[PDB]
Enzyme design. Structure first.
Site, PDB file in Angstrom:
ATOM      1  CG  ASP A 217     -17.509  -2.713   6.765  1.00  0.00           C
ATOM      2  OD1 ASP A 217     -18.177  -2.029   7.570  1.00  0.00           O
ATOM      3  OD2 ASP A 217     -17.796  -2.806   5.551  1.00  0.00           O
TER       4      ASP A 217
ATOM      5  CB  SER B 292     -12.261   8.716  -2.348  1.00  0.00           C
ATOM      6  OG  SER B 292     -11.826   7.588  -3.080  1.00  0.00           O
TER       7      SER B 292
ATOM      8  CG  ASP C 230     -14.015   7.313  -5.722  1.00  0.00           C
ATOM      9  OD1 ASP C 230     -12.916   7.830  -5.428  1.00  0.00           O
ATOM     10  OD2 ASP C 230     -14.616   6.547  -4.937  1.00  0.00           O
TER      11      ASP C 230
ATOM     12  CD  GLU D 267      -3.058  -0.829   0.036  1.00  0.00           C
ATOM     13  OE1 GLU D 267      -2.976   0.148  -0.749  1.00  0.00           O
ATOM     14  OE2 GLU D 267      -3.959  -1.699  -0.051  1.00  0.00           O
TER      15      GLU D 267
ATOM     16  CG  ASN E 169     -11.103   5.488  -0.308  1.00  0.00           C
ATOM     17  OD1 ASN E 169     -12.292   5.757  -0.273  1.00  0.00           O
ATOM     18  ND2 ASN E 169     -10.324   5.821  -1.323  1.00  0.00           N
TER      19      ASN E 169
ATOM     20  CG  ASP F  63      -6.759   4.898  -1.027  1.00  0.00           C
ATOM     21  OD1 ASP F  63      -7.946   5.122  -0.730  1.00  0.00           O
ATOM     22  OD2 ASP F  63      -6.422   3.970  -1.793  1.00  0.00           O
TER      23      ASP F  63
ATOM     24  CG  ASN G 253      -8.902   6.195  -4.510  1.00  0.00           C
ATOM     25  OD1 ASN G 253      -9.329   6.432  -3.378  1.00  0.00           O
ATOM     26  ND2 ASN G 253      -7.831   5.450  -4.722  1.00  0.00           N
TER      27      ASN G 253
HETATM   28 RU   LIG Z   1     -20.330  -2.153   9.248  1.00  0.00          RU
HETATM   29 RU   LIG Z   2     -19.544  -2.106   4.399  1.00  0.00          RU
END
Ligand SMILES: [Ru+3]
Ligand SMILES: [Ru+3]
Ligand SMILES: [Cl-]
Ligand SMILES: [Cl-]
Ligand SMILES: [Cl-]
Ligand SMILES: [Cl-]
Ligand SMILES: [Cl-]
Ligand SMILES: [Cl-]
Ligand SMILES: [Cl-]
Ligand SMILES: [Cl-]
Ligand code: NA
Ligand code: NA
Ligand code: NA
Length: 129
Positions: free
Chosen positions: A101, A50, A48, A35, A59, A52, A46
């Site tokens: 997540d 955004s 889009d 990374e 991000n 990092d 990025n």
């Molecule tokens: Ru979550």
């Molecule tokens: Ru998610």
């Protein structure tokens, strides 16, 4: 700050990343290598809009606030600049949320493409930990 390999492994372990969510320390060191090349000040924009940030290239679309990512969230409740500090605490604490997540370390595309399924223990070999 550009960490040494074993230096970063030790810092990550001190901050509780070793085996966090089942991911051994070498997975985290490998991810940071690809990374950021271990550079806390790494940033990358990025397509889009955004950005990092930091050793783990976290991000701004979801995880931190930079004031310049329309419609984004700040789920780690931090300015993205906190992810550039020589002190890795903010990056580690936010990475713990990311890896929890649902998709594990696949959240880091570079981990999936360059670390997953490899001999990640090589990244901590020889280190006094
Ligand atoms: Ru979550
Ligand atoms: Ru998610
Ligand atoms: Cl290296
Ligand atoms: Cl490992
Ligand atoms: Cl915010
Ligand atoms: Cl924003
Ligand atoms: Cl938010
Ligand atoms: Cl902020
Ligand atoms: Cl640190
Ligand atoms: Cl998992
Ligand atoms: Na340190
Ligand atoms: Na954001
Ligand atoms: Na600290």
């Amino acid at each position: 700050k550009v960490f040494g390999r074993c230096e970063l492994a030790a810092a990550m372990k001190r901050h509780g990343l070793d085996n966090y969510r089942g991911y051994s320390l070498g997975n985290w060191v490998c991810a940071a290598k690809f990374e950021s090349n271990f550079n806390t000040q790494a940033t990358n924009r990025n397509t889009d809009g955004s950005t990092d940030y930091g050793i783990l290239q976290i991000n701004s679309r979801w995880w931190c606030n930079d004031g310049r990512t329309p419609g984004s969230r700040n789920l780690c409740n931090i300015p993205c600049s906190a992810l550039l500090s020589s002190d890795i605490t903010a990056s580690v604490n936010c990475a713990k949320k990311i890896v929890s997540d649902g998709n594990g370390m696949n959240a880091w595309v570079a981990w999936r493409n360059r670390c997953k399924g490899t001999d990640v223990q090589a990244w901590i070999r020889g280190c006094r930990l």
